[PDB]
Amino acid sequence: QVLCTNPLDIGELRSFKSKQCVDIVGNQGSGNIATYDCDGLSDQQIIICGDGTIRNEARNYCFTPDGSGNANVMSSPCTLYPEIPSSQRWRQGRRKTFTDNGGIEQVATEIINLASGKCLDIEGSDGTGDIGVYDCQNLDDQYFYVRSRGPELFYGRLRNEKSDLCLDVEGSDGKGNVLMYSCEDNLDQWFRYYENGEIVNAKSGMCLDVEGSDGSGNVGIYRCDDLRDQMWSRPNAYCNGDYCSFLNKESNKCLDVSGDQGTGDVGTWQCDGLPDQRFKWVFDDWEVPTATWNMVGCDQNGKVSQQISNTISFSSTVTAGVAVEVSSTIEKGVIFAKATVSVKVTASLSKAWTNSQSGTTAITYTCDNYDSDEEFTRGCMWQLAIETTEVKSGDLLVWNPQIVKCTRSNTAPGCAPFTKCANEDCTFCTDI
Ligand SMILES: [Ca+2]
Ligand SMILES: [Ca+2]
Ligand SMILES: [Ca+2]
Ligand SMILES: [Ca+2]
Ligand SMILES: [Ca+2]
Ligand SMILES: [Cl-]
Ligand SMILES: [Mg+2]
Ligand SMILES: [Mg+2]
């Protein structure tokens, strides 16, 4: 598997103990792995692969123990032949569920190496430091979760009820002070708002933040830091139709524009019920996307192999702006087999879409195993299709990522992308 074609999850991998991110040194996706602050870079977007590997979005490299026994873990080239070695494959062990400080239900597990049976481990017991593998000893620092933000609640530009101006970040890179500006087709005016309270800027991937930690003062976009002053509520009681206030969870103050004309600098201030403290989400309507599987090929008496490409079909240019809009739409909800999918499936699909704007990156893929894990002796290869329609134009968008399932059946997989076929024919699912 040159690329991870059967991912189960994409996101930050967090220590249960410290809540720090599992980090590759620098930003290139290769090198030593240790804990660090979560910095929004693509190397900290970890890919939990169905083949047992753990990869990342910065570089197509694998979490790898440096030697046998207790050993350091680094991001290095995935070994593919004659097979991926058990040393670069991992499984989930025991689980812990918990509610994090943002109110999200998370699931942490042990991450166990298949060769040694040792646990992914952080030096010591505080959940900070160098990451390697070590005997499993049940402590919190050997539990890891892929961070869920919870559902994406809303998204788009935030337009002020008083002025009709939009939240904007100084400059164009999505970082720094937030103030009011004319609503335009700039990426840094687009935000996504989650159940965990975060309001995340599309340009920078950084969070709507109050200076310091007490929730009182100037508002800007700064590194998402998991603190309560970066959590926002949008209570029905403070709404006027689709224009609503945003109350800071730490201070209980309103997102506010200086004075009362809705034209100046943005911070938090005592709520006062005035129109300049209310904002509407402005976005174009796209239909709820649907996921299906397309047959690539079948071989009834051996392995199926075929070239697979990441393709996007759309009547117009998929600009940076279209891409952000489609990512937002996907994350809000997807239908598979007439049903909604879990938050991790939509979060991961939206991330895969964002990370699929670099071309076809064609590869040859061979079904060596059924999606359920057994050796592939016959069956079909299936490629994902995500379809949505922009409502104002009626233009259908079809995205075919390099996300595949190998099954024993001529019937399409009964499992959504980012979930695992439980049996060879793929009629039910695990890891949902
Ligand atoms: Ca890094
Ligand atoms: Ca330890
Ligand atoms: Ca700007
Ligand atoms: Ca802050
Ligand atoms: Ca004001
Ligand atoms: Cl403070
Ligand atoms: Mg390390
Ligand atoms: Mg400001």
From Swiss-Prot:
Optimum pH for hemolytic activity is 10. Hemolytic activity increases with increasing pH from pH 7 to pH 10, but almost no hemolytic activity is observed below pH 6.5. Binds to lactose between pH 4-10. Pore formation in artificial liposomes containing human erythrocyte membrane lipids lactosyl ceramide (LacCer) or globotetraosylceramide (Gb4Cer) increases with increasing pH. Cytotoxic effect on Madin-Darby canine kidney (MDCK) cell line increases with increasing pH with maximal cytotoxicity at pH 10 at 4 degrees Celsius, but no significant pH effect is observed at 37 degrees Celsius. Ca(2+) 1 binds at residues 23-24, 26, 43. Its cofactor is Ca(2+); Mg(2+). Ca(2+) 5 binds at residues 256-257, 259, 276. InterPro entries: CEL-III_C_sf, Ricin_B-like_lectins, Ricin_B_lectin. D-galactose binds at residues 9, 23-26, 39, 107, 121-124, 134-137, 168-171, 181-184, 209-212, 222-225, 256-259, 269-272, 276. Ca(2+) 2 binds at residues 121-122, 124, 141. Ca(2+) is required for hemolytic activity and the activity increases with increasing calcium concentration. Hemolytic activity is inhibited by N-acetylgalactosamine (GalNAc), lactose, lactulose, galactosamine, dextran with molecular masses greater than 4 kDa, to a lesser extent by inulin and only slightly by sucrose and melezitose, but not by glucose or mannose. The activity is abolished in the presence of 10 mM EDTA. Lactose-binding increases with increasing calcium concentration, but calcium has no effect on hemagglutinating activity. Residues 1-294 are annotated as: Has hemagglutinating activity towards rabbit erythrocytes, but no hemolytic activity towards them. Changing residue 345 to A: No effect on lactose binding. Alterations in oligomer formation and in hemolytic activity. Alterations in oligomer formation and in hemolytic activity. Changing residue 338 to A: Decreased antibacterial activity toward Gram-positive bacteria S.aureus IFO 12732. Markedly decreased hemolytic activity compared to the wild-type protein. No effect on lactose binding. PROSITE patterns: RICIN_B_LECTIN. Mg(2+) 1 binds at residues 32-33, 72-73, 131. Expressed in body fluid (at protein level). This is Galactose/N-acetylgalactosamine-binding lectin CEL-III. The gene is cel3.
